[PDB]
């Protein structure tokens, strides 16, 4: 979910912390329902992709000597 | 002294469970007010002091019963929010 500082920019208004929660509690209540395509493009406007870093170790190249 | 014995304040033990028999006896004497009575009687409470305590206990019971009734009445609306978002 977008953070309060990102919601405060889509709206161009100042928000309280409880104002943010009430809006999020209302979106979750919208996912649990049988939301259609029209009700899914709207929720994705407020979903920000969280990039997960790969913890897999980088492998060194195998070289050959003389 | 003149009454029959082993009738008043007498509880029979079941299956050798003496702990449960004693707890039942203590609960009996507590509910009838004997335990509090015996304790208050160790030292003389003066009549002005007894009236003050009896008045305080009677007013506290009324206030506690009245506060329980209010919470019971006002807990009917503790159900989930019907108009969430509005």
Describe the structure.
Chain A: This is Small ribosomal subunit protein uS9m. Chain A: Belongs to the universal ribosomal protein uS9 family. Chain A: It comes from Homo sapiens (Human). Chain A: It is found in: Mitochondrion. Chain B: It is found in: Mitochondrion. This is part of a larger assembly, with chains A (66 residues) and B (86 residues). By secondary structure, chain A is mainly α. Chain A has 3 helices and no strands. Chain A is elongated, with a radius of gyration of 21 Å. The termini of chain A are far apart. Chain B has 86 residues and is mostly helical. Helix content of chain B is 57%, strand content 0%. Chain B contains 3 helices and no strands. Chain B has helices at 18-31, 34-40, 47-74. Chain B is flat and about 75 Å long. Classes of the chains: A mainly alpha (66), B mainly alpha (86). At the A-B interface, α2 of A face loops of B.
Name some characteristics of this structure.
part of a larger assembly; 2 chains; A: 66 residues; mainly alpha; 3 helices; B: 86 residues; 57% helix; ribosome; mitochondrion; biogenesis; 28S ribosomal protein S9, mitochondrial; 28S ribosomal protein S21, mitochondrial
């Amino acid at each position: 979910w977008l953070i309060k500082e990102e919601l405060e920019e889509m709206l161009v208004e100042k928000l309280s912390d409880l104002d943010y929660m009430q809006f999020i509690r209302l979106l979750e209540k919208l996912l649990t329902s049988q939301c259609g395509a029209a009700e899914e493009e709207f929720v994705q406007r407020f979903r920000r992709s969280v990039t997960l870093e790969s913890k897999k170790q980088l492998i060194e190249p195998v070289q050959y000597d003389e | 002294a003149k009454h029959l014995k082993f009738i008043a304040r007498t509880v029979m033990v079941q299956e050798g469970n003496v702990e449960s028999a004693y707890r039942t006896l203590n609960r009996i004497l507590t509910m009838d007010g004997l335990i509090e009575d015996i304790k208050h009687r160790r030292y003389y409470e003066k009549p002005c002091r007894r009236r003050q305590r009896e008045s305080y206990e009677r007013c506290r019971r009324i206030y506690n019963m009245e506060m329980a009734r209010k919470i019971n009445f006002l807990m009917r609306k503790n159900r989930a929010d019907p108009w969430q978002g509005c």
